[PDB]
From Swiss-Prot, chain C:
Homotetramer. The chain holds residues 219 to 346 of 355 of the full protein. It comes from Mesorhizobium japonicum (strain LMG 29417 / CECT 9101 / MAFF 303099) (Mesorhizobium loti (strain MAFF 303099)). This is Cyclic nucleotide-gated potassium channel mll3241. GO terms for molecular function: cAMP binding; identical protein binding; intracellularly cyclic nucleotide-activated monoatomic cation channel activity; potassium channel activity; protein-containing complex binding. The keyword Membrane applies.
Amino acid sequence: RRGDFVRNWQLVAAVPLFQKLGPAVLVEIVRALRARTVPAGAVICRIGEPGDRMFFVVEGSVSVATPNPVELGPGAFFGEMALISGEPWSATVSAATTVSLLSLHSADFQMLCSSSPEIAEIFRKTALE
Amino acid sequence: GDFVRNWQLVAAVPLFQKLGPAVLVEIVRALRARTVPAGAVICRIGEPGDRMFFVVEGSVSVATPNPVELGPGAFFGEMALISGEPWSATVSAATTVSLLSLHSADFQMLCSSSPEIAEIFRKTAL
Amino acid sequence: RRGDFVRNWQLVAAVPLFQKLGPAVLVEIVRALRARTVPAGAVICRIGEPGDRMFFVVEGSVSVATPNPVELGPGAFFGEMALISGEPWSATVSAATTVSLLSLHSADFQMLCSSSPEIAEIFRKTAL
Amino acid sequence: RRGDFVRNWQLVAAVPLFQKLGPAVLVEIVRALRARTVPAGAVICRIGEPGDRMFFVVEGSVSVATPNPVELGPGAFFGEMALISGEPWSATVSAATTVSLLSLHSADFQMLCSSSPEI
């Protein structure tokens, strides 16, 4: 489906970290994404484990193991500091129902610094942080 | 213009799955639109819930571990729509966010026109 | 498909005669629509034949038999006038490709006067 | 607003002329598009004039000057031969209601078939 690409763009464009990134850039961000079906109950990211990627919950809902547990349905995303630095996950997130995941690996978003200055400026901005 | 955009957003919600076109068009008409600046608290922990929210533009943030954010096409507060339970997490705007909300009262008042809405309440009540 | 309903609503909502209609009224009109698939070359409406229905071209393009052979793609509609009066077609429109048709018959539209005040207001403003 | 952009993308991709084109290029087309809203009654393009651009209907309806006028609604497009070539508009098109439109100028379209010759 071609409409899936659009809705993925729509999700990607909505990321605060990506606000000053133009259309051309966003496309290649979307093209880099990796699709993964996750069964109900299965872990997506462990607490305290090395975050090397960002996640996008296209269809289905996810459970969040926190001081206050919350099930968050479709159109959800997390892991911005896993892209930029090597921040470990502050909470275990798992699939509440059948989950349709899209994943941005920190390697691919990084390999975009050569062609995109706006992305390059994200990492440099993380000098004092 | 916005109506069709709102129809499809609402029609994506599983709670509204078994609903019909005539019922759905009335729900869209009941929606309220609001644009919130980045940082402003939308709904707060512990406070009672009286509406359901839809993200149209931008993305909101859930304050638990500040991990999960919700972008366009996302929704929250299904149970605060039917029953009236307080929110399990504080939600606020990460960016400038365009939102729709369906007030619980306006949804409850559609039992008059929809056996399906009434059934949702009959099961939820018991 | 529920997806097709919203596309049909959107086209109906764009009809000049239908502008002063609320979202709920447009639902009854879309519910009244009749679907047909018509092969390329077939006549949708023939000049001089009585106009008893309005047409919506959901998929495919249509050709108008004007001295200039024009092809007008999907999202096309005509025969708005055929709901008001019995006036015959001024031209012949035919399918230029495979066409998915939607049809609102003048009779089905007419008896929505008892259902909804705005349609009844359309007939009053006409006859006045 | 990324709202209009997404709407414009899905709109142009539904048009057959752009079907066999990749996500990378459809975007550049969309950026090259210009938006205008026209009042009911106003002439968008005249018969016999110079065919400069292609048109996409967003909201409202335009009308084509046929004996019993044919209207084009949201998702409709017109003026294709004004890109593949540059010939007189074969019929006069005006606004039936208040119409929101997208337009692609033959300048930009040609200036984008060099980057990706797919047409």
